[PDB]
Design a protein around this motif. Structure first.
Motif: not given
Ligand code: NI
Length: 341
Positions: A33, A35, A38, A94, A116
């Motif tokens: 994802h 974010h 990450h 998420h 996540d």
């Protein structure tokens, strides 16, 4: 150097491992994802294959300028072959575009990496139901029984009713919602829908939301702040000083701010129900902290793992202290003894 819990044994693969330079033996880098903890390390100069969801791939191309030839988006719920290994991407519940990754190793081992996630019973009827999983790389963010929070639906009901009441009592009140990453869009979209307004925001944030495939988005968001009575601001500005300053900028159109900070968990959860949440107030400004989580509660996590019955669990969160690690391992053992696997 890359930690072991970001490496997929028996493959050339890593997961969420872009801040370690060229990882020895890595032939494909997966990204669960968009974010920053990450994706940290990606840019227009990255020249290895990146495997991800369509939405994540929109964001890599438009926000970080990764070149198209290196982005390999995969469809969800579909068996795909990557460097000779079968993989499936599953919805992680998420933020937009977030996935879990199922890896089917050439030797017969099956590995789930949750990225996540916020566990949900709906996951018990995806392609996970169809085979055994041997190893689970688990998002253990809230792996302790103190972490309870309400459903997302209860939290959005609270926010809609609170905003609708305040603005109907005072049509010159402005609603503000904080943000600093993608995720939690329901908060500001649901409030704008009940008020009959678009959400106003910066050009940079509008750009980001336009990468998300959210249906009818041109209908719900705008860069014209003057036409909007729900504004999005950086999370750092959601304090009395930041909000006083914003209200000055609105030129006397408004005379009151009602603001929302969607946190994950805060210790007011161990004592208070959602119904009972109250704001911090100073003058004509009120700030609500609402427990809108995009990670599993303790009980949601426990239910998922007791359903999946993995042979081995590898935590991916809270791994930096011996006390955290020991706590988590004790819960994993309880769960296994209680369920019987
Ligand atoms: Ni995340």
């Amino acid at each position: 150097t890359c930690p072991f819990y970001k490496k997929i044994p028996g493959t050339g693969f890593t997961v969420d491992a872009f801040q370690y330079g060229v990882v020895e033996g890595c032939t494909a880098y997966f990204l669960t994802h968009f974010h920053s903890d990450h994706y940290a390390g990606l840019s227009k100069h990255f020249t290895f294959p990146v495997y991800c969801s369509e939405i994540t791939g929109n964001l890599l191309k438009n926000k970080l300028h990764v070149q198209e030839q290196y982005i390999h988006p995969l469809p969800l719920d579909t068996e795909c072959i990557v460097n000779g290994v079968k993989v499936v991407l599953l919805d992680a519940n998420h933020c937009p575009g977030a996935v879990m990754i199922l890896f089917y190793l050439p030797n017969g081992t099956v590995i789930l990496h949750t990225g996540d996630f916020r566990a949900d019973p709906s996951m018990e009827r995806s392609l996970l139901a169809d085979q055994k999983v041997h190893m689970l790389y688990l998002d253990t963010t809230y792996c302790s029984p103190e972490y309870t929070f309400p459903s997302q639906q209860e939290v959005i009901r609270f926010a809609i009713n609170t905003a609708f009441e305040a603005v109907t009592l005072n049509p010159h009140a402005l609603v503000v919602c904080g943000t600093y990453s993608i995720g939690k869009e329901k908060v500001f979209l649901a409030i704008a829908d009940v008020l009959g307004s678009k959400v106003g925001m910066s050009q940079e944030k509008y750009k980001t939301l336009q990468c998300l495939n959210i249906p009818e988005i041109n209908s719900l968001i705008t860069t014209d702040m003057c036409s909007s009575l729900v504004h999005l601001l950086p999370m750092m500005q959601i304090n009395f000083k930041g909000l006083q300053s914003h209200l000055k900028k609105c030129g006397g159109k408004y005379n009151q701010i009602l603001a929302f900070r969607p946190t994950g968990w805060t210790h007011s959860n161990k004592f208070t129900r959602i119904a009972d949440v109250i704001p911090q107030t100073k003058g004509n400004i009120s700030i609500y902290g609402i427990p809108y989580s995009e990670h599993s509660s303790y009980l949601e996590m426990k239910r998922f793992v007791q359903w999946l019955k993995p042979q081995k669990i590898i935590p991916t969160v809270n791994v930096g202290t011996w006390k955290s690690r020991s706590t988590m391992e004790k819960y994993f053992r309880e769960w296994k003894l209680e369920a019987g696997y």
